[PDB]
Design a protein around this ligand. Structure first.
Ligand SMILES: Nc1ncnc2c1ncn2[C@@H]1O[C@H](COP(=O)(O)OP(=O)(O)O)[C@@H](O)[C@H]1O
Ligand SMILES: N=C(N)SCc1ccc(Cl)cc1
Ligand SMILES: [Mg+2]
Length: 322
């Protein structure tokens, strides 16, 4: 019975894998703060804090401290990490926990140090950082030990991370700020301009899951929100075609991120990727039809990982057990 853990500290979701157990926590990367006096106190972290997005009283706020793939607020990110690490601690298990945290290719020395220290301050005795695209690839079942290159396209909340891997190493990696959040924001902007309806970010994500698609058909759902000009609540019906229209720009920007990475690939790795194609991971990979859009624009096979939301945690989990 161990307290050793591997953490996927995602822009939108945090997962923890505990040695010998598997994934024991999976909660939004959100912290709610309450203004008391002139200071901010931690009010909630995780599932309850996400529920407060768009619903806070004046003296509270809900923050995603990793929202854009960078640490926006070190103290709030460290409180978020300490909360989750503390939450899964098993008093029956051994002390001196070894903690592995996944780190995106773009993370700075400053951010890596800050994650290291947050884990120490949360009780870790030793901290190891592992490259996130290696984690994604492993959890997606890619044979990353083989010499032939693999390309993984990991579409998260605040970023899409693209990497080419070979012989247990990363050869190329690029990050762009397009992913699940820009898809939500596109649906917000669509509803405003086309239906004069102002919607919250949690509603926008729901619309994306229920009817979002990367290609036109279709079916319809009710969407409720705030009237633009006059401010009273009302509702309108929106279709799959309309959702496709709304998502077309951020979908195109993901496709372009994939093309840019491909265009950097040297000849022998290009031959490797032209064979095996591209593996999609992250929750953004669940967008209906995104795989076909990428296939159509690249000419390459596109596969969606099993369980795309958990690939990174599963992969670093495997590393922790070995
Ligand atoms: N069924 C779905 N369709 C489209 N997008 C989805 C779906 N489920 C989750 N997502 C999106 O996936 C993103 C979360 O992906 P995730 O890999 O957890 O990101 P991160 O690792 O940065 O936290 C969010 O934008 C979420 O809305
Ligand atoms: N995990 C992501 N893809 S974004 C958050 C993050 C986590 C760790 C560091 Cl060092 C920087 C950013
Ligand atoms: Mg991620």
């Amino acid at each position: 019975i161990s307290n050793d853990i591997a953490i996927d500290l995602g822009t939108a979701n945090t997962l923890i894998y505990q040695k010998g157990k598997g994934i024991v926590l999976n909660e939004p990367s959100v912290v709610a703060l309450r203004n008391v006096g002139g200071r901010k106190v931690v009010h909630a972290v995780g599932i309850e804090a996400k529920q407060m997005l768009g619903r806070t009283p004046g003296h509270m706020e809900a923050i995603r401290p990793m929202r854009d793939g960078v640490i926006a607020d070190f103290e709030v990110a460290e409180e978020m990490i300490k909360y989750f690490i503390r939450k899964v601690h098993n008093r029956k298990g051994s002390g001196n926990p070894k903690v592995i945290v996944c780190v995106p290719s773009g993370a700075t020395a400053v951010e890596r140090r800050a994650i290291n220290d947050s884990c120490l301050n949360a009780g870790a005795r030793r901290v190891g950082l592992i490259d996130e695209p290696m984690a994604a690839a492993i959890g997606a079942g890619l044979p990353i030990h083989e010499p032939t290159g693999s390309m993984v396209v990991d579409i998260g909340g605040g970023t899409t991370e693209v990497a080419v891997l070979s012989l247990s190493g990363i050869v190329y990696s690029r990050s762009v700020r397009v992913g699940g959040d820009k898809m939500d924001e596109a649906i917000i902007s669509y509803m405003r301009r086309h239906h004069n309806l102002l919607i919250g970010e949690t509603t926008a994500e729901r619309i994306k899951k229920e009817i979002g698609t990367a290609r036109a058909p279709g079916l319809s759902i009710d969407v409720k929100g705030r009237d633009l000009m006059q401010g009273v609540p009302r509702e309108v019906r929106i279709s799959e075609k309309q959702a496709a229209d709304a998502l077309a720009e951020p979908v195109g920007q993901i496709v372009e991120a994939v093309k840019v990475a491909l265009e950097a690939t040297p000849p022998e790795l290009a031959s490797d990727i032209a064979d095996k194609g591209i593996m999609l991971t992250g929750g953004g990979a669940l967008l209906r039809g995104l795989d076909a859009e990428i296939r159509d624009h690249t000419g390459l096979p596109v596969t969606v990982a099993d369980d795309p939301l958990s690939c990174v945690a599963l992969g670093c989990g495997k590393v922790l057990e070995h």
